[PDB]
Every structure is written in structure tokens, then in C-alpha cells.
Design a protein around this ligand. Structure first.
Ligand SMILES: O[C@@H]1[C@@H](O)[C@H](O)OC[C@H]1O
Ligand code: NA
Length: 129
């Protein structure tokens, strides 16, 4: 799958600790996110050109960070996307960050880190050139 496509969060290959649920904007979100949870998207093709990451997120708390790691849940970090409260678990906004240069095909781990409690819900994400 292309890094530059819209990747629905619920389309993960593997996950730890989360649950999918009905998303107010349509489709599903990955919710029940606590510090240390993650989702994995296999065989993402970055080509040569990546510069950024955009995630569609909601949070009734104070959010947290999405660590973007390659090939394992503790693997090389290529960006950390800050996520901020939106006042409701089903009112979404765009969280965005820069991403270090990378090439080729990798399994992408989105590793959710933050304070105590639930962090945010993730509807979909994408990378930008
Ligand atoms: O959306 C989820 C909500 O349904 C649950 O009650 O709290 C955790 C959130 O992620
Ligand atoms: Na979704």
C-alpha cells in the first residue's frame, strides 16, 4: 500500500491493546488507546519523497503522541505526531508532523504514547511528499 494513500486506521495488519468502533464521521475509528498501545500497517511503500504525516484524530482528554516507527514496535523512529484534545471522542481534527527521510517498503507501527487514561481515537492517516 502506498504511504501517500489514505490509510484507514481500522485496516491494520496487527494491533496491540486497541478496539475498533463506530466513527461519527463515517466508517470506524481505532479507540480505547492507552500509553503503549499500537497498530501496524504492513508493506507500506514510501518510494523516495516522504516529508510529512497527517492523522485524523479525536480526543476527550489531552491527546498524546503518535510515534511513527518502522518495522517493529520499538523500531527506528521517523516522526512523532502530537495530538491535542478536541473536546469529544467523536469530534475530529487533523494532527500533523514532519517525517524523516525514508525509502522503500516498511511495516509502519503507530505507537501511542502519553499521560494516563485514554489518549485519542484515530480515524485514518496518510503521509505527504
Ligand atoms: O471512543 C472511546 C469511547 O467509546 C470510550 O468510552 O472511551 C475510550 C474512547 O477511545
Ligand atoms: Na477510519
Amino acid at each position: 500500500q502506498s504511504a501517500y494513500s489514505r490509510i484507514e486506521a481500522e485496516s491494520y495488519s496487527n494491533q496491540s491493546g486497541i478496539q475498533t468502533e463506530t466513527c461519527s464521521e463515517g466508517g470506524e475509528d481505532v479507540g480505547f488507546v492507552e500509553n503503549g498501545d499500537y497498530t501496524v500497517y504492513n508493506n507500506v511503500d514510501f518510494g523516495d519523497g516522504v516529508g510529512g504525516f497527517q492523522a485524523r484524530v479525536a480526543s476527550a482528554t489531552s491527546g498524546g503522541n503518535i510515534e511513527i516507527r518502522l518495522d517493529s514496535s520499538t523500531g527506528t523512529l521517523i516522526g512523532t505526531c502530537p495530538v491535542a484534545g478536541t473536546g469529544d471522542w467523536q469530534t475530529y481534527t487533523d494532527a500533523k508532523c514532519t517525517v524523516s527521510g525514508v525509502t522503500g517498503k516498511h511495516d509502519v507501527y503507530l505507537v501511542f504514547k502519553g499521560d494516563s487514561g485514554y489518549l485519542f481515537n484515530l480515524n485514518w492517516f496518510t503521509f505527504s511528499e
